[PDB]
Amino acid sequence: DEPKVKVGEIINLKIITEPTSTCRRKQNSTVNFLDIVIFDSKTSKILPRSNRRILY
């Protein structure tokens, strides 16, 4: 929500997940893991300790 953020706004990100019609496939794993990764707009691969950057 509201993509103009100045500096100091701790702002929640919202993720809505829905498994597809291939929910019938595996079913012996009941958990899967969701890495949220962070890219710069110009450059790539911000390291996950992420100082002077997004803190989470």
Partner: protein, 50 residues
């Protein structure tokens, strides 16, 4: 003479959580970065609030 003696309990001394501090300097505002993990690498920890 209610003697409840010799309850030979063994107690452990190992603080299970471990906190690392990092002080990010900034102009007129300040940031704390906090790395939290277990003591030893086979006993995992649940956390509730900080």
């Amino acid at each position: 003479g209610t003697f409840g003696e010799t309850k030979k309990v063994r107690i452990q001394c190992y603080l299970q959580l471990s906190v690392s501090v990092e002080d990010i300097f900034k102009k007129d505002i300040f940031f704390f970065k906090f790395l939290l993990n277990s003591s030893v690498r086979e006993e995992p920890v649940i956390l509730y609030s900080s």
